[PDB]
Amino acid sequence: TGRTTIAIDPVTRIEGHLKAEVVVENGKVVDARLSGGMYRGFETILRGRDPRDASQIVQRICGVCPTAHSTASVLALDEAFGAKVPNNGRITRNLIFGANYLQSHILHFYHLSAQDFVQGPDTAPFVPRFPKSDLRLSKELNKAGVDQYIEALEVRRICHEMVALFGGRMPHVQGQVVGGATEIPTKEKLVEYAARFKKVRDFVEQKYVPVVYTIGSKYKDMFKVGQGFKAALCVGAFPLDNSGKKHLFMPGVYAKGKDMPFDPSKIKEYVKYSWFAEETTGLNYKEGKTIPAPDKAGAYSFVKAPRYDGLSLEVGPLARMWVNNPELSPVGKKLLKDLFGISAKKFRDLGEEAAFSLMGRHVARAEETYYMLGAIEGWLKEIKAGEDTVVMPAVPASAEGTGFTEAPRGSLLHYVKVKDSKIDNYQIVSASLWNCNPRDDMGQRGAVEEALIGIPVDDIQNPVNVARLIRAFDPXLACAVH
Amino acid sequence: GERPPVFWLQGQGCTGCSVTLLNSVHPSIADVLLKVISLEFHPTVMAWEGEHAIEHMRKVAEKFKGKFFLVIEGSVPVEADGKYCIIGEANHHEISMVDALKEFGPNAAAVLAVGTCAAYGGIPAAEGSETGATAVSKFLGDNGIKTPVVNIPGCPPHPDWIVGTVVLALDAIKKNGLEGGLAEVVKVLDSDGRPTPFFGRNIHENCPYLDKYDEGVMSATFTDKVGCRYDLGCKGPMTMADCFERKWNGGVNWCVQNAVCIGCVEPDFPDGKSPFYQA
Numbered sequence: 001t002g003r004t005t006i007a008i009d010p011v012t013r014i015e016g017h018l019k020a021e022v023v024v025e026n027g028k029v030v031d032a033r034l035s036g037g038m039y040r041g042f043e044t045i046l047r048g049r050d051p052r053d054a055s056q057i058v059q060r061i062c063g064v065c066p067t068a069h070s071t072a073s074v075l076a077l078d079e080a081f082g083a084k085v086p087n088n089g090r091i092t093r094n095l096i097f098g099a100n101y102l103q104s105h106i107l108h109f110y111h112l113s114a115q116d117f118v119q120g121p122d123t124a125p126f127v128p129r130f131p132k133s134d135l136r137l138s139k140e141l142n143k144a145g146v147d148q149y150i151e152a153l154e155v156r157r158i159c160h161e162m163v164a165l166f167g168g169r170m171p172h173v174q175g176q177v178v179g180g181a182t183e184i185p186t187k188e189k190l191v192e193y194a195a196r197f198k199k200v201r202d203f204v205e206q207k208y209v210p211v212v213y214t215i216g217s218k219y220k221d222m223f224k225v226g227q228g229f230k231a232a233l234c235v236g237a238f239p240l241d242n243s244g245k246k247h248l249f250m251p252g253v254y255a256k257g258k259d260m261p262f263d264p265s266k267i268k269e270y271v272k273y274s275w276f277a278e279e280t281t282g283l284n285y286k287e288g289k290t291i292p293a294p295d296k297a298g299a300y301s302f303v304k305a306p307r308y309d310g311l312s313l314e315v316g317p318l319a320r321m322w323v324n325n326p327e328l329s330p331v332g333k334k335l336l337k338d339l340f341g342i343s344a345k346k347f348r349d350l351g352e353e354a355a356f357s358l359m360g361r362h363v364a365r366a367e368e369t370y371y372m373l374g375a376i377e378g379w380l381k382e383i384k385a386g387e388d389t390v391v392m393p394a395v396p397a398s399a400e401g402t403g404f405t406e407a408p409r410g411s412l413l414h415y416v417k418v419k420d421s422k423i424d425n426y427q428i429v430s431a432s433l434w435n436c437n438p439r440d441d442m443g444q445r446g447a448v449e450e451a452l453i454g455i456p457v458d459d460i461q462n463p464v465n466v467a468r469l470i471r472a473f474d475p476x477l478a479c480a481v482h
Numbered sequence: 483g484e485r486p487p488v489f490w491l492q493g494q495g496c497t498g499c500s501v502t503l504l505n506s507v508h509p510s511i512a513d514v515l516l517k518v519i520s521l522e523f524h525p526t527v528m529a530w531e532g533e534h535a536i537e538h539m540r541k542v543a544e545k546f547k548g549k550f551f552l553v554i555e556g557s558v559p560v561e562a563d564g565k566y567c568i569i570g571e572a573n574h575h576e577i578s579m580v581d582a583l584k585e586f587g588p589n590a591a592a593v594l595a596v597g598t599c600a601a602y603g604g605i606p607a608a609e610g611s612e613t614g615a616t617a618v619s620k621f622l623g624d625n626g627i628k629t630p631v632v633n634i635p636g637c638p639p640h641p642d643w644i645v646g647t648v649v650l651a652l653d654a655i656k657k658n659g660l661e662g663g664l665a666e667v668v669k670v671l672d673s674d675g676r677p678t679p680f681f682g683r684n685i686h687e688n689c690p691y692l693d694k695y696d697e698g699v700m701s702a703t704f705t706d707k708v709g710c711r712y713d714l715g716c717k718g719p720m721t722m723a724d725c726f727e728r729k730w731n732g733g734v735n736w737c738v739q740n741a742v743c744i745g746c747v748e749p750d751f752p753d754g755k756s757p758f759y760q761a
């Protein structure tokens with residue numbers, strides 16, 4: 001069969017405003033373009049402000065992952081100010097941010113992704129939908145998915161209570177500032193956090209991780225598509241001491257079958273196909289500029305195109321779990337064997353092709369949630385009730401700093417330059433920017449655009465696999481554009 | 483009863499309004515969606531997608547003309563002919579936020595502007611912006627659209643402010659009909675369009691640390707929880723919200739206990755509340 005061109009705007013069950021356009025020929029996607037359609041311009045709004053304001057302003061980039069922006073911002077300010085965060089404040093920050101990884105992954109699998117595989121109750125917003133939605137689960141298993149969707153609404157809310165115990169409220173924490181964390185954990189509140197954590201752990205271990213493998217076992221074809229470039233980035237996150245060298249996720253790049261070190265000087269943002277002034281193309285974030293040009297011919301997105309030494313990379317749980325190669329959860333080892341016939345001990349034992357796939361990205365996110373449980377457990381044993389968590393540094397007149405972390409959806413950095421005690425430049429290079437960007441100046445596609453190539457569309461009137469692939473990356477176009 | 487149809491349109495928002503609503507305790511969000519409203523369009527959570535999702539909203543809007551509720555999150559950017567916020571595409575034409583509000587705004591029973599961006603402009607309209615970010619009520623009024631607007635601000639709002647305002651409006655409508663009930667709702671809005679049950683009282687005048695403020699005992703570090711937070715930048719004196727007793731996230735904390743209030747429900751947020759960390 002010949003060509004059909006399919007445009008999907010809005011892509012739903014993601015965060016933010018995305019259009020996807022695919023060219024389908026002979027039953028498969030052969031080309032793709034992703035367009036982020038909403039712009040705010042945080043990088044220019046921030047200029048001229050007290051630098052400390054940034055750690056509040058930047059959270060409003062995104063209300064799903066605000067703790068990630070909070071973290072990147074306070075780390076950038078820590079560096080620029082020379083703030084020496086007390087050890088107990090480092091641990092408290094990890095407890096605040098770590099709890100939102102749990103919230104975000106659970107939200108993503110159940111409340112964004114699960115309807116890709118599960119038919120919900122017969123009322124809006126679960127209907128109407130594609131008449132041939134390729135929903136393969138038995139009546140019993142489908143009902144279990146719905147029951148878990150509903151339970152997960154409570155579980156994700158409990159995760160935000162965990163965030164707020166030391167973070168003040170959520171969305172948009174008050175508890176992270178330059179110099180540490182604003183509230184010393186008390187014994188009583190650590191018990192409150194731990195009691196909630198126990199409930200979340202039980203749900204993750206007993207419901208979430210098992211259901212991803214079980215649903216995956218009914219959609220084994222979804223491990224055979226969505227590979228894209230098979231190239232990934234991790235910038236490091238969650239310091240495990242004050243050395244700056246040991247982190248829960250260590251940095252690294254993976255491309256063309258090879259692990260390599262991460263050098264942030266190799267990041268450049270291109271704009272040929274983005275609605276920004278042509279003269280701003282090719283800038284490292286330390287020299288970044290944000291000049292919107294919504295009428296520029298040929299451009300199709302408000303997302304800039306980040307490249308790592310010319311490479312188009314993806315970010316997120318798969319990227320981190322592939323780069324770091326942790327041991328798999330006990331659940332995963334067992335169900336990989338029983339449901340897939342796969343003998344696996346560590347994450348890379350899935351194999352490159354199955355890991356870098358539509359369903360593989362859901363598996364990676366579930367496994368990463370399990371991995372984060374152990375980190376939070378450790379921080380709950382490491383934190384010292386009553387020990388001070390903040391220093392109060394003076395604002396410098398002239399300074400620069402960069403904060404690197406891993407948001408739930410992938411690598412995040414904030415760069416700040418201070419002049420006359422005010423923000424002179426602030427540049428954000430975020431997770432969904434790495435995933436959902438358009439072509440660069442040489443025409444090389446972004447990671448999701450490339451991962452769409454080969455996606456099967458056997459029925460052009462029900463092209464469900466297009467958005468299923470997109471959703472596996474957990475896109476957040478608010479983050480991507482800012 | 484028959485749950486009213488709701489369309490949730492996101493302009494220049496961060497989805498924080500949707501997330502805060504997901505944190506509702508009583509009623510839970512599942513109870514809200516299955517028993518209180520019929521959420522017919524919401525891009526973050528709905529089953530369908532693309533032009534079919536847009537067309538579904540249009541069909542419901544036709545069937546329930548004058549009777550659906552339109553929730554607007556985020557500001558509405560008017561520069562560049564609306565191109566800074568495209569929300570969909572149908573029949574080979576892109577639909578900007580400007581277009582969508584002009585299309586659905588006139589036919590809604592009421593518009594609920596949720597969050598400070600939609601209510602007042604917020605961060606997207608702050609100094610250094612260049613998209614023409616516009617508050618919902620201003621956009622509608624500038625275009626001659628007379629539909630009542632209820633502002634439920636906050637960055638984000640507390641879930642109880644959103645759910646509670648919906649419940650208050652639906653109660654009014656049950657007992658007085660649509661026009662009568664909306665008249666009663668408008669009567670309990672302050673001059674900034676905010677329901678007085680949630681926004682009628684000042685944070686600072688009801689703050690547990692007011693004794694320390696009056697005694698001049700001020701914390702010099704964030705982690706000193708004995709003193710008043712004014713010197714650290716607390717904007718409670720200029721802020722109208724009930725956080726001092728409602729608290730956040732199931733009662734586990736609130737901004738003043740944890741750090742400072744940044745005045746997030748006020749029409750001048752953020753610029754009139756900045757710098758956040760000095761008085």
Ligand code: SF4
Pocket residue numbers: 685686687689690691692693695710711712716717718719738743
């Ligand atoms: S300045 Fe803030 S902390 Fe102090 S009494 Fe007023 S509201 Fe409370």
Ligand code: SF4
Pocket residue numbers: 636637685721722723725736737738742743744745746747
């Ligand atoms: S305490 Fe102040 S900053 Fe916090 S939610 Fe209430 S009004 Fe907003």
Ligand code: FCO
Pocket residue numbers: 062065068069407408409410411412430431432433475476479480
């Ligand atoms: N997670 C998250 Fe948000 C995105 N994409 C950031 O950074």
Ligand SMILES: [Fe+2]
Pocket residue numbers: 043304427428429430481482
């Ligand atoms: Fe950026």
Ligand code: NI
Pocket residue numbers: 015061062063064065066476478479
């Ligand atoms: Ni985000």
Ligand SMILES: [S]
Pocket residue numbers: 015062064065409475476479
């Ligand atoms: S996000």
Ligand SMILES: [S]
Pocket residue numbers: 064065066067068069100101104407408
């Ligand atoms: S986050």
